Amino acid sequence: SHMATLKVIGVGGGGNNAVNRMIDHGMNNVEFIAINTDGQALNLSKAESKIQIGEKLTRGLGAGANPEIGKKAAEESREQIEDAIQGADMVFVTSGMGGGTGTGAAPVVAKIAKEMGALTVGVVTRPFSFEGRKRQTQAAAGVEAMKAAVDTLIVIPNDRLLDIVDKSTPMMEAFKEADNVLRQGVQGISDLIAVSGEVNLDFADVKTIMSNQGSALMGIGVSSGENRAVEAAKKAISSPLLETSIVGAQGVLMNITGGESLSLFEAQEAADIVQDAADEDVNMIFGTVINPELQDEIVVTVIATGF
Ligand SMILES: Nc1nc2c(ncn2[C@@H]2O[C@H](COP(=O)(O)OP(=O)(O)CP(=O)(O)O)[C@@H](O)[C@H]2O)c(=O)[nH]1
Numbered sequence: 001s002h003m004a005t006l007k008v009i010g011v012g013g014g015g016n017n018a019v020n021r022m023i024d025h026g027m028n029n030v031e032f033i034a035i036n037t038d039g040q041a042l043n044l045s046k047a048e049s050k051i052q053i054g055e056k057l058t059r060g061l062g063a064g065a066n067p068e069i070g071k072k073a074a075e076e077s078r079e080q081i082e083d084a085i086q087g088a089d090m091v092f093v094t095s096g097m098g099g100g101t102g103t104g105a106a107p108v109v110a111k112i113a114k115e116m117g118a119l120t121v122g123v124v125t126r127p128f129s130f131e132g133r134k135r136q137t138q139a140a141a142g143v144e145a146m147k148a149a150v151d152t153l154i155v156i157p158n159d160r161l162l163d164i165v166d167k168s169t170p171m172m173e174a175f176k177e178a179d180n181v182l183r184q185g186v187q188g189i190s191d192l193i194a195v196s197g198e199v200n201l202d203f204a205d206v207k208t209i210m211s212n213q214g215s216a217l218m219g220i221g222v223s224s225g226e227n228r229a230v231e232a233a234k235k236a237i238s239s240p241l242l243e244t245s246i247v248g249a250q251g252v253l254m255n256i257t258g259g260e261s262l263s264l265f266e267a268q269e270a271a272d273i274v275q276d277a278a279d280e281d282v283n284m285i286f287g288t289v290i291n292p293e294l295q296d297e298i299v300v301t302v303i304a305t306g307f
């Protein structure tokens with residue numbers, strides 16, 4: 001029997017903010033690593049494993065928007081990064097693009113993870129338009145470098161946060177909504193790995209859907225009542241925060257979890273929703289889990305690739 005090790009690695013300020021908020025919210029069986037040039041921020045990290053990179057280059061400060069310094073910092077700490085990753089079967093690298101440490105170091109961290117044998121997923125933000133064109137261009141180069149280094153990449157443009165707030169929503173509450181993309185994806189995969197299903201999916205199926213694929217979508221939806229399966233499936237695939245929507249997906253892993261009432265008909269309905277929304281002939285990997293503790297709730301987990 002296989003026991004997959006999942007790790008989440010925050011790189012730079014926004015990545016380490018996401019790690020801190022995920023640890024606060026509560027996650028289990030997931031190991032966290034914080035990587036930064038900024039020593040003061042690392043002192044505030046809740047991560048069990050902390051790597052300060054680039055101290056000779058930055059004297060414990062951030063990289064000051066210089067991605068070449070963030071890249072050199074990570075490269076010069078390769079052995080320390082390898083040691084922290086060793087043993088991971090899957091690594092999620094999260095970082096905010098546009099600055100120096102995230103833009104420059106995150107693609108190096110991802111390359112090291114993949115070289116170490118981990119299935120490597122990047123979840124990164126693009127800067128708000130109000131941060132200006134140069135930051136957006138620098139972030140775009142980081143995204144391209146990430147894409148070349150990971151198995152799959154999920155990009156969250158921060159401008160989409162402006163579509164989900166009202167005029168008073170606290171900035172921190174908006175940031176938590178972006179964190180949910182990563183957190184719910186990690187949780188969904190962790191649950192798929194650990195919980196035996198009646199139509200069982202495991203980590204090998206995650207590897208098949210994700211390995212060397214490029215852009216990806218990861219989503220969870222939960223609903224109850226009439227039309228629950230369709231409603232949960234639509235929620236799983238319809239996040240307003242994503243650069244890569246479901247449209248165009250050629251491969252999908254879909255798991256449905258429900259109670260003993262889970263019907264064959266509604267499983268087909270959920271699968272058809274995903275395929276219809278992809279508007280492609282999708283190569284599906286389908287799973288089902290019966291959790292009797294659940295009563296009327298249904299949970300649909302989707303990972304889509306092949307764009
Ligand atoms: N959604 C979200 N975006 C963030 C968050 N923190 C920063 N950002 C965004 O990430 C981008 C990079 O910020 P940051 O992670 O602090 O960069 P850095 O590379 O570590 C800083 P330096 O350039 O000094 O090394 C910012 O321009 C902003 O768009 C966060 O917590 N949540």
Ligand SMILES: [Mn+2]
Nearest residue numbers: 062063064065
């Ligand atoms: Mn800085």
